[PDB]
Ligand SMILES: N[C@@H](CCC(=O)O)C(=O)O
């Protein structure tokens with residue numbers, strides 16, 4: 471009796487530690503403070519340049535990491551970055567629009583945290599081009615008429631990806 | 645009038661090569677959101693155009709030691725393209741050297757990453773379940 | 780920073796920055812799931828269950844998922860915090876070299892559109 | 896398993912050859928793990944270098 475008393479006490483105590491401990495990347499800060507999970511960005515794009523120029527401590531620390539490890543963690547395309555997330559312990563700094571497309575099609579992937587910054591995509595022109603203001607007005611017309619939203623839905627069609635123990639003792643009973 | 649030269653870059657779902665069995669030529673090779681945008685702009689503004697992939701495969705950044713740009717941004721600086729129609733971010737450093745329309749889409753940088761009855765046999769080791777039965 | 784660019788009278792009021800904040804039998808039905816209470820409704824079987832309930836309840840009493848200072852806010856992110864944009868309190872945090880306050884500034888700056 | 900695991904603790908001491916390249920790597924590094932390690936090694940230098 472004293473023997474079984476100790477055992478059942480041990481089982482209970484031990485089972486508690488596994489439940490106590492049972493009770494996680496959520497932000498850039500979480501990446502910046504570690505190195506086991508590598509991270510990076512598209513070389514020679516805007517995301518890279520944001521980190522390269524930033525004076526914000528979290529982002530400056532991330533740039534120092536990406537610069538150090540750049541032959542491995544800076545990639546030449548979003549496609550390459552995605553393949554690194556899928557095939558290694560790697561988080562990819564990517565624009566949110568593109569993340570929305572990727573996560574609707576790769577259901578094992580997700581966006582971590584929110585937006586780090588805010589920017590737009592625009593049609594580029596040489597400095598001084600007369601087309602710049604004409605394209606602005608055309609874009610505003612397309613937005614207001616609903617055509618840009620229709621185009622996003624079209625190219626953004628990803629109707630996919632969502633956004634015990636005690637039992638074992640029952641079977642041995644029956 | 646002269647067709648405008650439009651620089652772009654492959655990036656799904658903005659700009660892609662169309663799938664087909666017959667070979668495709670010229671502008672007919674491409675599809676995507678930015679291709680549909682370009683088609684709409686061309687109809688509203690009354691221009692024709694020729695799509696060309698940026699030869700270096702880059703969006704564009706400035707070299708820190710020699711100060712030269714690359715990518716689509718450099719194509720515009722050098723007047724080798726009339727327009728860049730692509731998911732091209734409007735940024736401080738770029739707006740000092742090229743011009744941009746107001747945005748057709750808004751976004752931000754974020755992070756892409758990943759998301760047993762044997763939990764009953766673990767607490768008390770298999771070796772222990774055995775001995776407790778032998779005893 | 781302001782006295783370097785404008786000129787102030789001596790004070791009419793003295794003050795400092797501080798923090799403004801706010802001041803179930805179902806915790807018994809949680810440890811052992813409603814689904815489990817059902818199925819449970821033989822000695823070795825009940826032994827395991829009561830042991831599980833005890834162990835699990837202990838976990839609950841340990842973690843159990845009190846703010847007294849800026850240090851307590853700085854160490855966490857569940858409770859957000861901020862300040863008036865473009866005022867003296869914001870600028871105090873923005874300029875501070877003191878570890879607690881520099882950590883708070885990093886948080887406020889990150890989340891500025893929501894917390895300033 | 897890693898430098899990160901050493902950096903996060905102080906029970907196990909760590910160090911390097913004084914006035915060599917490894918020491919200088921830590922002394923110069925901006926990478927958080929390695930800068931934390933340098934602070935430890937510098938503090939405890941008479942014993943760990
Ligand atoms: N859209 C970016 C490239 C992708 C990125 O930097 O995340 C650019 O205009 O440079």
Ligand SMILES: N[C@@H](CCC(=O)O)C(=O)O
Pocket residue numbers: 862863865866867868869
């Ligand atoms: N009284 C402050 C504004 C309020 C604050 O910063 O808390 C000032 O002079 O800027």
Ligand SMILES: N[C@@H](CCC(=O)O)C(=O)O
Pocket residue numbers: 911912914915916917918
């Ligand atoms: N080989 C090193 C010395 C040994 C070390 O620093 O680990 C040097 O050239 O400084």
